[PDB]
Design a protein around this ligand. Structure first.
Ligand SMILES: CNC(=O)[C@@H]1Cc2ccc(NS(=O)(=O)O)cc2CN1C(=O)OCc1ccccc1
Ligand SMILES: [Cl-]
Ligand SMILES: [Cl-]
Ligand SMILES: [Cl-]
Ligand SMILES: [Cl-]
Ligand SMILES: [Cl-]
Ligand SMILES: [Mg+2]
Length: 297
């Protein structure tokens, strides 16, 4: 059981060892498509690639490759697409994927510039009157509105298939204060944001999988998805004791490499799930407490 295990790991000072065990046991599957020479400029990082078996294939229509993986959580009955921050030449591919996969939400856990470097393209419009046209993939993208909070921003976007003139509302949830290889400021700030995504209906099984990304689409993205799936599993069962966090992480790692990048991110995941369980198991009042503690205003 996770809280008893947490205390034992904390007491014995063994987060590094627990995390290394996970790394040791994690799946290794081929990424042959990712490593084709023609795809070199579609990958942000040499050593971060989607496995062939779970890669998202684009439907157009000359080269189907995008650095993005379908994390299909069978027991939980929820799926996520985890992807790298799009590059200057892959923003059209990114939105093509959102359209084809029928996603309603995009969760962004990084900033465009981190540590002086460009870790993600400016792939969405920052001003209503300056829409983006992706001529390669025949899509238009317009900012409809935004709600700016202290550490996150929610945007309403309209994505249009220029081929058909069909339009869809996409919700963009941008966590702006999650440092690379680091953790959220508190369980409360993380959970307040996760519940904002949940409340939107973006994780509904009636939609395609939410797209989640950071810069590599593994560390911060893995942490987010691990906490969400653990919370969902205990919710379905109304049984916190039924959830084996390490097992869930290993299951996710069947679908994309390197999910959760540090031992402290693993530790934070346990904290987030232990805290979130208070809400799942019926202390409704904790949600307001997280909102207050997050200082979102
Ligand atoms: C220190 N590592 C690096 O700088 C590069 C790029 C990067 C940016 C950012 C990042 N953090 S994230 O944006 O939260 O995913 C992770 C990685 C992983 N990486 C890798 O080379 O990862 C290879 C790897 C490691 C463990 C497991 C699978 C693959
Ligand atoms: Cl940014
Ligand atoms: Cl900077
Ligand atoms: Cl970039
Ligand atoms: Cl950072
Ligand atoms: Cl790793
Ligand atoms: Mg303006």
């Amino acid at each position: 059981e996770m809280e008893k295990e947490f205390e034992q790991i904390d007491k014995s000072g063994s987060w590094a060892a627990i995390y290394q065990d996970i790394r040791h046991e994690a799946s290794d599957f081929p990424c042959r498509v990712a490593k084709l020479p023609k795809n070199k400029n579609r990958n942000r990082y040499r050593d971060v690639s989607p496995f062939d078996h779970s890669r998202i294939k684009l439907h157009q229509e000359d080269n189907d490759y995008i650095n993005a993986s379908l994390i299909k959580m069978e027991e939980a009955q929820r799926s996520y697409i985890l992807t790298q921050g799009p590059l200057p030449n892959t923003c059209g591919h990114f939105w093509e994927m959102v359209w084809e996969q029928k996603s309603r939400g995009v969760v962004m856990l990084n900033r465009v510039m981190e540590k002086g470097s460009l870790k993600c393209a400016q792939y969405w419009p920052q001003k209503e009157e300056k829409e983006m046209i992706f001529e390669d993939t025949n899509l238009k993208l317009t900012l409809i509105s935004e709600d700016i909070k202290s550490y996150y921003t929610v945007r309403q976007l309209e994505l249009e298939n220029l081929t058909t003139q069909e339009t869809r509302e996409i919700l963009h949830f941008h966590y702006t204060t999650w440092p690379d290889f680091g953790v959220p400021e508190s369980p409360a700030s993380f959970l307040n944001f996760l519940f904002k995504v949940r409340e939107s209906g973006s994780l509904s099984p009636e939609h395609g999988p939410v797209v989640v990304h950071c810069s590599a689409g593994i560390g911060r993205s893995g942490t987010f998805c691990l906490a969400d799936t653990c919370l969902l599993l205990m919710d379905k069962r109304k049984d916190p004791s039924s959830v084996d966090i390490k097992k869930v992480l290993l299951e996710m790692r069947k679908f994309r490499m390197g999910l959760i990048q540090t031992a402290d991110q693993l530790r934070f995941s346990y904290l987030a799930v232990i805290e979130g369980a208070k809400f799942i198991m019926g202390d409704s009042s904790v949600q307001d407490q997280w909102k207050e503690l997050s200082h979102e205003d």
